[PDB]
Amino acid sequence: MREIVHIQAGQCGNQIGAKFWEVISDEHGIDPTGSYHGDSDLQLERINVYYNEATGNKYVPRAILVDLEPGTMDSVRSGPFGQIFRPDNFVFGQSGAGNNWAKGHYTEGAELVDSVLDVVRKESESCDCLQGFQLTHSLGGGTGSGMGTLLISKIREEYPDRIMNTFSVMPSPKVSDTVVEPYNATLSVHQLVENTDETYCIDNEALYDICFRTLKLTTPTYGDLNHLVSATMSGVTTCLRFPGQLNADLRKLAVNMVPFPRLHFFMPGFAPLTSRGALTVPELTQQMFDSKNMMAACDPRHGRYLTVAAIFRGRMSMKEVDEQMLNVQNKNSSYFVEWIPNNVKTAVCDIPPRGLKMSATFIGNSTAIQELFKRISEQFTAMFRRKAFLHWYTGEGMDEMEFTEAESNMNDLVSEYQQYQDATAD
Amino acid sequence: KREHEREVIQKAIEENNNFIKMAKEKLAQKMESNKENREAHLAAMLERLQEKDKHAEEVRKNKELKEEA
Amino acid sequence: MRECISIHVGQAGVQIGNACWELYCLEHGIQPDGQMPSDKTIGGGDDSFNTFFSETGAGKHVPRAVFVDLEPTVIDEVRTGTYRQLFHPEQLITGKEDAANNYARGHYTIGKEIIDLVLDRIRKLADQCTGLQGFLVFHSFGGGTGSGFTSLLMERLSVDYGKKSKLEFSIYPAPQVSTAVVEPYNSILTTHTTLEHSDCAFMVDNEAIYDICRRNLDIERPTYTNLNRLISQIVSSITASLRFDGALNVDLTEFQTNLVPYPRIHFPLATYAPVISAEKAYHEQLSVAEITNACFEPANQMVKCDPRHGKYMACCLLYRGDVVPKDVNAAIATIKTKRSIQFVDWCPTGFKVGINYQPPTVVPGGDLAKVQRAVCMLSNTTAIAEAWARLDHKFDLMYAKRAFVHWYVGEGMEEGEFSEAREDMAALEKDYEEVGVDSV
Numbered sequence: 001m002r003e004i005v006h007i008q009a010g011q012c013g014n015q016i017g018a019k020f021w022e023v024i025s026d027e028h029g030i031d032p033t034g035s036y037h038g039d040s041d042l043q044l045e046r047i048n049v050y051y052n053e054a055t056g057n058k059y060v061p062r063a064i065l066v067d068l069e070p071g072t073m074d075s076v077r078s079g080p081f082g083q084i085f086r087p088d089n090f091v092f093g094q095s096g097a098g099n100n101w102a103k104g105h106y107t108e109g110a111e112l113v114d115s116v117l118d119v120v121r122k123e124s125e126s127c128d129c130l131q132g133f134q135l136t137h138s139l140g141g142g143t144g145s146g147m148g149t150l151l152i153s154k155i156r157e158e159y160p161d162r163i164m165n166t167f168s169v170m171p172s173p174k175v176s177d178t179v180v181e182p183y184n185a186t187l188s189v190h191q192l193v194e195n196t197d198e199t200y201c202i203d204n205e206a207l208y209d210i211c212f213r214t215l216k217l218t219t220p221t222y223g224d225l226n227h228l229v230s231a232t233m234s235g236v237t238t239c240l241r242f243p244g245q246l247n248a249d250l251r252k253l254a255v256n257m258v259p260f261p262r263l264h265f266f267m268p269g270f271a272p273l274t275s276r277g278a279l280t281v282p283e284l285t286q287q288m289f290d291s292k293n294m295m296a297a298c299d300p301r302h303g304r305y306l307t308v309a310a311i312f313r314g315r316m317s318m319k320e321v322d323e324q325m326l327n328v329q330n331k332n333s334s335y336f337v338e339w340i341p342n343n344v345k346t347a348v349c350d351i352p353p354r355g356l357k358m359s360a361t362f363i364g365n366s367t368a369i370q371e372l373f374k375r376i377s378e379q380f381t382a383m384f385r386r387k388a389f390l391h392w393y394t395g396e397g398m399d400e401m402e403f404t405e406a407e408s409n410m411n412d413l414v415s416e417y418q419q420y421q422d423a424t425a426d
Numbered sequence: 427k428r429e430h431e432r433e434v435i436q437k438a439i440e441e442n443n444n445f446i447k448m449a450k451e452k453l454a455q456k457m458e459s460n461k462e463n464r465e466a467h468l469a470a471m472l473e474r475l476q477e478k479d480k481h482a483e484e485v486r487k488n489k490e491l492k493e494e495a
Numbered sequence: 496m497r498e499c500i501s502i503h504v505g506q507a508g509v510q511i512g513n514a515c516w517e518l519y520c521l522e523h524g525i526q527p528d529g530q531m532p533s534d535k536t537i538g539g540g541d542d543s544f545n546t547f548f549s550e551t552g553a554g555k556h557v558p559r560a561v562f563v564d565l566e567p568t569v570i571d572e573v574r575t576g577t578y579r580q581l582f583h584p585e586q587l588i589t590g591k592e593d594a595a596n597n598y599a600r601g602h603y604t605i606g607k608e609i610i611d612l613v614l615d616r617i618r619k620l621a622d623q624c625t626g627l628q629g630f631l632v633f634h635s636f637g638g639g640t641g642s643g644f645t646s647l648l649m650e651r652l653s654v655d656y657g658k659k660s661k662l663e664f665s666i667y668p669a670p671q672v673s674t675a676v677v678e679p680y681n682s683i684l685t686t687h688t689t690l691e692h693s694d695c696a697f698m699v700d701n702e703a704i705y706d707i708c709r710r711n712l713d714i715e716r717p718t719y720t721n722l723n724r725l726i727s728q729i730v731s732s733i734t735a736s737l738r739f740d741g742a743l744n745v746d747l748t749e750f751q752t753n754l755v756p757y758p759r760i761h762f763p764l765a766t767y768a769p770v771i772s773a774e775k776a777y778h779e780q781l782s783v784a785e786i787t788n789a790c791f792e793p794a795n796q797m798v799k800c801d802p803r804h805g806k807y808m809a810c811c812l813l814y815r816g817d818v819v820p821k822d823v824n825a826a827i828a829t830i831k832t833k834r835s836i837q838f839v840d841w842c843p844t845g846f847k848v849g850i851n852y853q854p855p856t857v858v859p860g861g862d863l864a865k866v867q868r869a870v871c872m873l874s875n876t877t878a879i880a881e882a883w884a885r886l887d888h889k890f891d892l893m894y895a896k897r898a899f900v901h902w903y904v905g906e907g908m909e910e911g912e913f914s915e916a917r918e919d920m921a922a923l924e925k926d927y928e929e930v931g932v933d934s935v
């Protein structure tokens with residue numbers, strides 16, 4: 001088998017991590033007790049990618065729960081699927097991080113990082129053939145951002161030849177008011193460029209807009225945002241969890257999606273996105289390429305597509321899907337780079353998600369993702385020029401030099417995206 | 427003519443052996459060069475990660491110095 | 496005597512191997528358990544089908560084949576499939592981690608860990624041969640194993656078997672069923688590395704096969720199963736001379752003499768007819784002239800190219816079924832006066848003909864109709880260089896920006912290997928231009 005080790009750090013990481021395990025357990029027919037009560041052999045054919053098999057035909061998720069406070073993880077254990085997780089895989093501290101990246105990365109997370117690595121090492125030893133790791137966390141906090149990036153580097157040190165995948169939640173003023181989130185995001189992005197192979201940009205700015213503008217939710221809660229995350233995370237891992245030919249493992253996905261090592265930040269998309277209160281393949285295809293369906297607050301028509309992965313789920317005409325995918329590329333040829341031929345790959349899965357007859361999941365590597373990083377950089381520089389709240393970081397041992405280096409590296413990342421956006425075949 | 431017949435078949439043997447020799451040597455050079463290159467790339471990756479660990483130790487040590495004052 | 500060993504590499508090679516060996520068993524009356532009631536010599540023999548099948552004491556007819564893949568799931572289907580009793584377990588070799596569509600991993604990082612075991616298993620088959628003639632290597636161009644590991648195997652086979660014949664069935668990538676953006680890279684790398692180690696290579700363009708299934712078989716969205724059933728028919732036609740005996744049967748090596756004028760010009764163009772559905776074939780018998788004429792329709796070629804815009808260096812017709820030379824000669828004479836058949840000035844214009852009387856067979860439940868007579872044309876035309884040109888153009892677009900190259904450099908390869916491989920392709924395209932120029 002080709003196993004994936006799942007890690008969730010911080011409050012946001014454990015929240016969206018819990019919802020991810022609930023959704024895929026339902027798709028694979030796994031109850032909260034870890035038993036299988038499904039009706040399709042396709043559910044168990046690649047079940048070992050995310051689940052360990054124990055005595056009594058029990059399927060235990062290969063997930064590790066990490067936080068610097070017991071609060072979020074205690075509620076996870078009390079959740080609907082809290083009893084399906086391995087109790088020894090809970091690694092929590094007491095002091096917390098206080099939304100300080102340095103405490104997560106240098107002071108408090110470093111005291112707990114070794115205990116997490118022991119659980120990671122235990123899960124990796126029992127892997128027949130480990131693919132790599134997927135991390136769920138946010139970049140605006142202290143534990144998921146600080147200790148999450150610390151865990152990536154430490155794991156990269158012991159598993160340098162494995163794929164490092166992250167589901168990173170981008171901070172936005174429309175969701176949380178912690179004013180130093182641009183600091184934490186920039187410091188985390190500085191680490192994600194160097195130590196991850198592929199990162200899904202889950203932007204709370206886009207999640208709020210979808211819930212408000214599209215889903216008509218005046219007061220979007222974290223549950224409303226996480227429902228979009230769970231649907232997106234289920235779609236992007238469909239090729240990993242079910243039999244298929246395209247992007248069936250993390251490395252093949254990275255090879256098809258990452259043309260240059262630093263440009264590995266993806267723009268997720270999902271369709272349909274309809275609110276409470278018959279869909280066709282052309283409508284499903286057109287909707288998934290629309291900016292309103294993106295999980296990152298970026299307009300793809302403000303940039304150019306380097307690589308795109310498209311996943312269709314449900315019973316539909318594969319002939320129609322091929323025609324519509326060709327149609328959207330021909331009609332939007334200017335938005336796909338000419339120097340990467342056939343850069344759009346399409347996969348079809350028979351099993352649809354829960355509650356949907358048909359769905360489409362969009363994975364794009366677009367130069368328009370610089371809009372997301374520009375928004376973070378603009379908020380970062382608005383405070384760093386005033387040296388606001390810096391003593392909370394420098395008091396843990398950091399200096400202003402590290403903030404400047406993180407700012408420059410992210411600004412370089414934007415420049416590199418603009419470079420290949422302006423590149424031409426001739 | 428008998429001498430020429432011997433020279434032709436010996437020439438065929440020599441060229442076949444030389445082709446085998448060249449194929450074996452070229453492959454061994456490629457496999458050794460590839461092994462060194464991949465190990466060098468992994469060594470550079472690990473060294474950068476170790477430098478991050480050294481930076482982290484410096485940061486934590488810097489916190490103890492200011493806490494004393 | 497004259498045994499042939501088949502090597503199936505990667506998913507494409509293995510799955511095409513499944514279709515071919517199932518078709519071979521149906522053609523020779525071999526049961527899924529390997530028993531062949533018509534074979535009265537138990538435990539061995541020198542019959543024509545023994546070039547592809549060895550015989551055990553228990554009467555089992557075992558393919559002279561090795562299946563190799565760096566990932567187990569595809570070959571696991573063989574281990575549990577309908578023809579699982581056909582192969583000894585040691586003939587099916589699997590790793591745990593594939594090459595991830597990366598030539599470097601298939602050739603170096605992962606392939607080096609299994610290459611010695613594969614050669615040992617191949618040696619075991621060779622030791623059972625009294626007259627080993629050569630190898631048939633089935634692989635894709637675009638996959639990491641099909642490109643990287645195949646070239647590594649071909650280099651090792653040249654060392655361990657000298658200049659013994661090695662023929663390829665190579666799957667040319669098509670966007671309709673491709674699975675990796677870097678397939679032009681893997682295609683150029685494996686073509687360069689294998690070029691001096693291959694005596695003859697039959698390229699199969701997946702788009703050509705895809706179009707034939709849609710156009711001639713009314714399949715809306717052809718699958719690998721649809722494509723592989725058609726591919727095995729062409730492979731069966733090519734190998735029918737080795738597996739069957741007849742007065743008008745002409746050995747494939749004899750065709751190979753005409754097909755390869757220079758060592759690097761060894762990529763014949765294959766055209767097969769008739770490809771027709773059961774509904775359309777009912778009450779519609781296709782004659783020798785009709786199937787021969789379809790061989791010069793470019794829509795029936797296994798590689799998309801225009802021979803009418805190139806020059807011929809060889810033309811071979813491989814008939815099977817109810818075919819006699821009188822009908823062949825009349826059909827050829829009609830075609831010579833109605834088709835754009837221009838030969839280079841340094842080559843004879845005669846057509847080389849072979850006939851196997853054994854009628855074509857079809858897998859039950861397939862889409863191909865069972866016909867009384869079929870033909871496969873093997874032509875050496877300069878137009879096949881267009882397939883290189885399309886692949887090389889895709890290579891140049893990505894390599895000018897060094898896109899995805901870090902995945903190869905990270906596995907130990909150097910940029911020099913890319914430029915060296917591309918320059919060899921440029922020389923290969925130049926070679927095909929040079930052979931088409933008239934003599935002075």
Ligand SMILES: Nc1nc2c(ncn2[C@@H]2O[C@H](COP(=O)(O)OP(=O)(O)OP(=O)(O)O)[C@@H](O)[C@H]2O)c(=O)[nH]1
Nearest residue numbers: 505506507510593594596635638639640641672719
């Ligand atoms: N005709 C045909 N082509 C196939 C088949 N399977 C894969 N391909 C083609 O082969 C190419 C990909 O190579 P694969 O054989 O699947 O990959 P591989 O050789 O196993 O190498 P890795 O999986 O990367 O380690 C694509 O262009 C596919 O279209 C098949 O069954 N029939």
Ligand SMILES: Nc1nc2c(ncn2[C@@H]2O[C@H](COP(=O)(O)OP(=O)(O)O)[C@@H](O)[C@H]2O)c(=O)[nH]1
Nearest residue numbers: 010011012015138140141142143144171176222
């Ligand atoms: N989408 C989503 N975002 C969250 C959730 N919880 C926290 N966040 C975001 O994460 C950031 C705060 O990070 P947090 O998880 O509290 O930090 P940590 O617990 O120290 O790792 C804020 O910008 C929030 O918008 C959640 O359940 N869903």
Ligand SMILES: [Ca+2]
Nearest residue numbers: 534536539540
């Ligand atoms: Ca016999």
Ligand SMILES: [Mg+2]
Nearest residue numbers: 011012099141
């Ligand atoms: Mg919080």
Ligand SMILES: [Mg+2]
Nearest residue numbers: 505506566593
């Ligand atoms: Mg494979």
